[PDB]
Amino acid sequence: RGEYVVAKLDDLVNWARRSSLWPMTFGLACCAVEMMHMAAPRYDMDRFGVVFRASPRQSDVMIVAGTLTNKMAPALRKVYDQMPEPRYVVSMGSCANGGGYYHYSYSVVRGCDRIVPVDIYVPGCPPTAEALLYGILQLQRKIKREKRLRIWYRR
Amino acid sequence: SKVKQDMPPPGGYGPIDYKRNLPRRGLSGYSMFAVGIGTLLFGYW
Amino acid sequence: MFMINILSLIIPILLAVAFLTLVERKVLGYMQLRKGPNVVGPYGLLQPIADALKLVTKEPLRPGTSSISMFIIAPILGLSLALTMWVPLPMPYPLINMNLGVLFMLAMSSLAVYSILWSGWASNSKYALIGALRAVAQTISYEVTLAIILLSVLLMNGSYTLSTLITTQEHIWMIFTSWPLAMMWFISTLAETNRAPFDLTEGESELVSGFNVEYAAGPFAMFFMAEYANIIMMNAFTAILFLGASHDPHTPELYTINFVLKTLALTITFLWIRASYPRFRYDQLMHLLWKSFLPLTLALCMWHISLPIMTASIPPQS
Amino acid sequence: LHHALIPHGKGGRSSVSGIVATVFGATGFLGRYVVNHLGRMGSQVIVPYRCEPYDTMHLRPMGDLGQIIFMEWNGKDKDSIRKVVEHSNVVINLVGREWETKNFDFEDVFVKIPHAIAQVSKEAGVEKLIHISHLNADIKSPSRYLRSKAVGEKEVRAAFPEATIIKPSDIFGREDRFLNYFASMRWFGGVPLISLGKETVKQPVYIVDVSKGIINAIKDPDAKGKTFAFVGPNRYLLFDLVQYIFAVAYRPFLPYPLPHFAYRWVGRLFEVSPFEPWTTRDKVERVHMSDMTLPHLPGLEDLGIQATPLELKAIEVLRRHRTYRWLTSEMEDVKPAKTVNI
Amino acid sequence: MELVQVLRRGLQQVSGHGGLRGYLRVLFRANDVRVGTLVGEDKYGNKYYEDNKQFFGRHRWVIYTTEMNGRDTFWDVDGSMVPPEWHRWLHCMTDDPPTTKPPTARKYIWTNHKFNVSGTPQQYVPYSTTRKKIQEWVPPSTPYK
Amino acid sequence: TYKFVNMREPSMDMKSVTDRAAQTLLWTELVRGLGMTLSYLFREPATINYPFEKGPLSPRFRGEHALRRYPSGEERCIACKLCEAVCPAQAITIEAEPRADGSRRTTRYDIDMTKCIYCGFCQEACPVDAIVEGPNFEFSTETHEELLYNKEKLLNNGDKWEAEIAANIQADYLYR
Numbered sequence A: 001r002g003e004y005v006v007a008k009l010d011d012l013v014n015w016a017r018r019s020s021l022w023p024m025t026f027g028l029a030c031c032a033v034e035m036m037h038m039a040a041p042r043y044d045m046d047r048f049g050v051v052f053r054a055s056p057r058q059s060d061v062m063i064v065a066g067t068l069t070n071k072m073a074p075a076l077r078k079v080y081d082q083m084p085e086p087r088y089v090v091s092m093g094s095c096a097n098g099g100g101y102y103h104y105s106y107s108v109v110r111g112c113d114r115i116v117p118v119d120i121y122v123p124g125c126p127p128t129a130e131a132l133l134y135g136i137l138q139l140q141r142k143i144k145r146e147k148r149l150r151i152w153y154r155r
Numbered sequence B: 001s002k003v004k005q006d007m008p009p010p011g012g013y014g015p016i017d018y019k020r021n022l023p024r025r026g027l028s029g030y031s032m033f034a035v036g037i038g039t040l041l042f043g044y045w
Numbered sequence C: 001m002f003m004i005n006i007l008s009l010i011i012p013i014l015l016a017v018a019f020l021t022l023v024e025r026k027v028l029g030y031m032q033l034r035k036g037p038n039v040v041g042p043y044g045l046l047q048p049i050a051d052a053l054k055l056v057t058k059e060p061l062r063p064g065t066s067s068i069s070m071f072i073i074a075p076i077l078g079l080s081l082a083l084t085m086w087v088p089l090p091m092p093y094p095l096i097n098m099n100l101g102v103l104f105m106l107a108m109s110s111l112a113v114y115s116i117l118w119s120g121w122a123s124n125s126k127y128a129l130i131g132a133l134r135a136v137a138q139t140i141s142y143e144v145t146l147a148i149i150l151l152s153v154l155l156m157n158g159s160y161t162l163s164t165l166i167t168t169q170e171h172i173w174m175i176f177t178s179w180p181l182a183m184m185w186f187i188s189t190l191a192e193t194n195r196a197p198f199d200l201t202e203g204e205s206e207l208v209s210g211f212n213v214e215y216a217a218g219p220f221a222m223f224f225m226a227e228y229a230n231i232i233m234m235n236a237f238t239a240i241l242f243l244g245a246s247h248d249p250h251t252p253e254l255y256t257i258n259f260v261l262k263t264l265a266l267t268i269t270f271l272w273i274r275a276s277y278p279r280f281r282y283d284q285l286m287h288l289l290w291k292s293f294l295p296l297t298l299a300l301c302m303w304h305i306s307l308p309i310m311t312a313s314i315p316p317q318s
Numbered sequence D: 001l002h003h004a005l006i007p008h009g010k011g012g013r014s015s016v017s018g019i020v021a022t023v024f025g026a027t028g029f030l031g032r033y034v035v036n037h038l039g040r041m042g043s044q045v046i047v048p049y050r051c052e053p054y055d056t057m058h059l060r061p062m063g064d065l066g067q068i069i070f071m072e073w074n075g076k077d078k079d080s081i082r083k084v085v086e087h088s089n090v091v092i093n094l095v096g097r098e099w100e101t102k103n104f105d106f107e108d109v110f111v112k113i114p115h116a117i118a119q120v121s122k123e124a125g126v127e128k129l130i131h132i133s134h135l136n137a138d139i140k141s142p143s144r145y146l147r148s149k150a151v152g153e154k155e156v157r158a159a160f161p162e163a164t165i166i167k168p169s170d171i172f173g174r175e176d177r178f179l180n181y182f183a184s185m186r187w188f189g190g191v192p193l194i195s196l197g198k199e200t201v202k203q204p205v206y207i208v209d210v211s212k213g214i215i216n217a218i219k220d221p222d223a224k225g226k227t228f229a230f231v232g233p234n235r236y237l238l239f240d241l242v243q244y245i246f247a248v249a250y251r252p253f254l255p256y257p258l259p260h261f262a263y264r265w266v267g268r269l270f271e272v273s274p275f276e277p278w279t280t281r282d283k284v285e286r287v288h289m290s291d292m293t294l295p296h297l298p299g300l301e302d303l304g305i306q307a308t309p310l311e312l313k314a315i316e317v318l319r320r321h322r323t324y325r326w327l328t329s330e331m332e333d334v335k336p337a338k339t340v341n342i
Numbered sequence E: 001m002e003l004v005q006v007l008r009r010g011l012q013q014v015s016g017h018g019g020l021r022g023y024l025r026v027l028f029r030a031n032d033v034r035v036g037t038l039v040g041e042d043k044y045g046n047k048y049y050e051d052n053k054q055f056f057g058r059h060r061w062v063i064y065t066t067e068m069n070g071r072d073t074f075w076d077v078d079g080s081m082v083p084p085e086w087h088r089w090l091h092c093m094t095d096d097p098p099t100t101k102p103p104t105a106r107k108y109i110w111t112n113h114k115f116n117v118s119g120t121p122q123q124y125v126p127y128s129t130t131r132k133k134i135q136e137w138v139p140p141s142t143p144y145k
Numbered sequence F: 001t002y003k004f005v006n007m008r009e010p011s012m013d014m015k016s017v018t019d020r021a022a023q024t025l026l027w028t029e030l031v032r033g034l035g036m037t038l039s040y041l042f043r044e045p046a047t048i049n050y051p052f053e054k055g056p057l058s059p060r061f062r063g064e065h066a067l068r069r070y071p072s073g074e075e076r077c078i079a080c081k082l083c084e085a086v087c088p089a090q091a092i093t094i095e096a097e098p099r100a101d102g103s104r105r106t107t108r109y110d111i112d113m114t115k116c117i118y119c120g121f122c123q124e125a126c127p128v129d130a131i132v133e134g135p136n137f138e139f140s141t142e143t144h145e146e147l148l149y150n151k152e153k154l155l156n157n158g159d160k161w162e163a164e165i166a167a168n169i170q171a172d173y174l175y176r
């Protein structure tokens, strides 16, 4: 029946989506250096069919990392809006998650969620490359448990 | 007891190398040009 | 019966072009001590299908300032000329036996710049327009070197008929007779296709996207497929002028695999070259061509145009 | 009011204001702004969600952590609504399908659910209800839009005695689907105008005022069965809207008079699409259903908010529709069209 | 001569994987076709392996169980599925597999390790665990004086 | 002491000029750049596959917090309050009241997990090492709320990660 047809099509689409997650790593601080340990020869980032990509026009997940100041805030939202559908932002590190140890500072916005709809919160200071890779795997499974075609079919 | 912290051995560690060890290799400038022109002459012939 | 051959020619290129991205990503990985895509299917073989249709199922935003007509025309003509470019290849029996096939090769290679120019202009972005005219000025500057080197090479062949190359290059590779022009030809190829070290037209950390700029699922994939269609073939042109193979008519398969392997090994070097070397600056990228290549190009053309007359070894044009 | 519900805080994101809103179907035009206003001063939103969470993602950065709660629900099952409003100081309804769907017709989204949530919310002992119904709600009206709202109007009236039914007229805003509508008639060749649109005046109101009305109606005592009506400050003629938008869109305009006989085919053909039916038969007939100027029903000023003029907020929505050719042209380039306001 | 034993390892890989079906299972589920000694097996089905010859990092590895605590897992490999006792040996924090040295017996230790529960009904939700302040008044029950 | 790094006189004989002329013409230092790239291709990659394998750590790792308890079973947290006075992000929050028997256990111990930096200071602060940082680092989430920890969630971490940290501290307290 039709329900099975859309379910298989839904499986196929998300298989691509949970495979070629070309990332906008928008890290700014010591969360940024530890992420390269996830683009490492030690833990390959390219091995899960995902390659660090410039030109935000072709990007799917935006890795936000490092402390987020007020000055950066206008620039972070504009690039997020330039990012195409689908777009997921993974908050990396204590600073980008809730503000972190730079919480009460006069020039830090507490957490990136106040500016962008975060999909995955990766805790850490810095989040070890394994931990942030685990978050990417967590986001990968999130794409798997997606029902885009089901909602349209059952609208 | 007695102190068993991380210590160097009483004989000391082994040698360490701090050099630009780029190795001289290949051929001589006359040789490369000569063998290069030889192949060209072979190709022409 | 003929649309057979067209489809039996076209679809393999698209499949070959697509799997070059895998081959590139994995080669580079092992080049800089990595494994590359290996989790999406066995040895990542299904990853090309994963990203390709992904680059067809992700939303294709049209920039507000972009002119739709040119933003659509540029990928179309960039892709169209690459596919038509493959028709005169003397692969055993060429599909199109144009007696002026080499001119046909260069005529279409001179129109990919329009795909570069319009896409840069159509995007109507400051970052695009400086990327465009710089990109186009690079590639048409290497046109003169590209044209002359061939003129030296086929001068010993007899004509511009591509199928005649197998007859001329029968006993020895033509590289053994024009190896000064060999790397001279080969190095100019990366300039045209814009591959590192001559990768000024992309610049992921400098030009961010280069002439591709604001391109996503849709027109971008064509550009990525177009750029990875020219790379596969400049091997075939190189593997035809330079190193070739015998063409025993009883076994055309013998020419196929032998030709295919050379066009595979050379594509590895193209991918291999991008790995090590730094990326050129524009001034030197033009300085190397106009000042360090052109005087060399002109001299070799004089040598290659007087050598057959000197040795009474002019080739038969028929 | 409960001790935990005591409103203290300077109207900030993490401030406590006591409004336990349960906005239904917030994944829409005014669901987007209502939570923003609800989340501006701090008020737990419990919004039912049924669609994919991704389309609900952009509602998350609208309040403090632990304020905007996403809860699964079903339109048919009563127990789903029972859980979403089991703890709700107020309940706000906006659910309504603007086109035709295979699984939902007009009434199923306009009489069943709005009344179903109405009775269960009273069953759940709610204290308010701000269900909405289009201000041109008439059974006698040919448009099944207005017929459905009117029967929905009485259904929530009897079910909830204190149902402060909301009567909003045409509403314009960033994704209003109306100002974007007349902008999109360019892609259908010459712009078709039924009877040229010589006899249709409508009252559009900027949504932020519409959203401001709902929250003000939430916090103002009054309510409890009122029938507030929401209209703009001025009304243009149907031509007069289309000339204004096309002027501020700077797009070429061909007002070709198109008889309603072909609107039946046009509305049907755009509906046959297995995707979003851009135009439906009820839409092709609601275009001339000119909004009235009823004075009896209370307006925005009754709540205490003034309706921004349409010509004041035009670029904000429509700068996207105009191309790069006139991207930097502001209000002063485009004068306001003929004002036939009452 | 050096080529034959390399292919011998390649064919031995299928032999150690329990046939072609087992080989394709690990090749797809785990994407790591390697034969290693069985060091131990925990209480969920997680099979642990060790290979001295492999370098540091590939020294010890694990192919996870197909089922644990309800979640069916065949294409759902995760890092939170490792029970705490094997979390030491697997991360190479100590050369002592739990099957050799078992954890010190305590009453309060969880008998079933849990995976990452985020995004599911049984996920975590924060709340204030203090009791209350400012106790309110209470009058007898009939209103207005 | 000092050492010059750039000064160098190129030899100016015919062989030397030919060497340099060949180097520019027949690219040899370029090919050397390619030469040791192949050596890197024909080498074992250091790619640790995940979650199947794990990059090595140490018995001192600082990660997810977990409040432990005595071998008899009673909470180690004394409400000594010191962890706050050292917490440089002020992430933790301790408030306690006399229990039913009278032994003070905190009525609220809410480490704001997206606030701390995993100092190890809170561990170094506790006189009864109640609060520790478990070896787990894979505790990402999708809602910002689940990061915000509390007393119960801390205790569950302590009861879940109990054998490991008991072993880690057992093998690391001597250094401490």
Ligand SMILES: CCCCCCCCCCCCCCCCCC(=O)OC[C@H](COP(=O)([O-])OCC[N+](C)(C)C)OC(=O)CCCCCCCCCCCCCCCCC
Pocket (backbone or CB within 6 Å): B036, B037, B040, C179, C180, C181, C182, C183, C184, C186, C187, C197, C242, C273, C277, C287, C288, C291, C292, C293, C296, C303, F024, F025, F026, F027, F030, F031, F034
């Ligand atoms: C009887 C004999 C008649 C003929 C004899 C001809 C003369 C003898 C042979 C001379 C050498 C051959 C001709 C010149 C070639 C070099 C041209 C040139 O300008 O070079 C210097 C140029 C310029 O060097 P430069 O700029 O440092 O110095 C030149 C002088 N100034 C400074 C004034 C400009 O440099 C290069 O070409 C460097 C490499 C650029 C491209 C980067 C990628 C290289 C990839 C190499 C590996 C792959 C090789 C593949 C080979 C083909 C395989 C099929």
Ligand SMILES: NC(=O)C1=CN([C@@H]2O[C@H](COP(=O)(O)OP(=O)(O)OC[C@H]3O[C@@H](n4cnc5c(N)ncnc54)[C@H](OP(=O)(O)O)[C@@H]3O)[C@@H](O)[C@H]2O)C=CC1
Pocket (backbone or CB within 6 Å): D025, D026, D027, D028, D029, D030, D031, D050, D051, D075, D094, D095, D096, D097, D098, D104, D109, D132, D134, D168, D169, D170, D171, D172, D176
């Ligand atoms: N300018 C305006 O906004 C005007 C609005 N109105 C009325 O006000 C309301 C506008 O709501 P708005 O959000 O802007 O509408 P939308 O155009 O966004 O679509 C309807 C909204 O309700 C949801 N919805 C639709 N059908 C159902 C259903 N069967 N069950 C549950 N949820 C459903 C939609 O989400 P999803 O698609 O995922 O179900 C969406 O949030 C409607 O009642 C409409 O008739 C009237 C005149 C003008």
Ligand code: SF4
Pocket (backbone or CB within 6 Å): A029, A030, A031, A065, A066, A067, A092, A093, A094, A095, A096, A100, A101, A124, A125, A126, A127, F117
């Ligand atoms: S969260 Fe920690 S590691 Fe990341 S930027 Fe902030 S202080 Fe640095």
Ligand code: SF4
Pocket (backbone or CB within 6 Å): F076, F077, F078, F079, F080, F081, F082, F083, F084, F094, F125, F126, F127, F128, F129, F130, F131
């Ligand atoms: S965790 Fe330790 S230091 Fe902190 S309050 Fe409890 S007993 Fe005191």
Ligand code: SF4
Pocket (backbone or CB within 6 Å): F083, F086, F087, F088, F089, F090, F091, F092, F111, F115, F116, F117, F118, F119, F120, F121, F122, F123
């Ligand atoms: S380790 Fe973390 S929770 Fe403990 S004191 Fe340091 S910052 Fe605070």
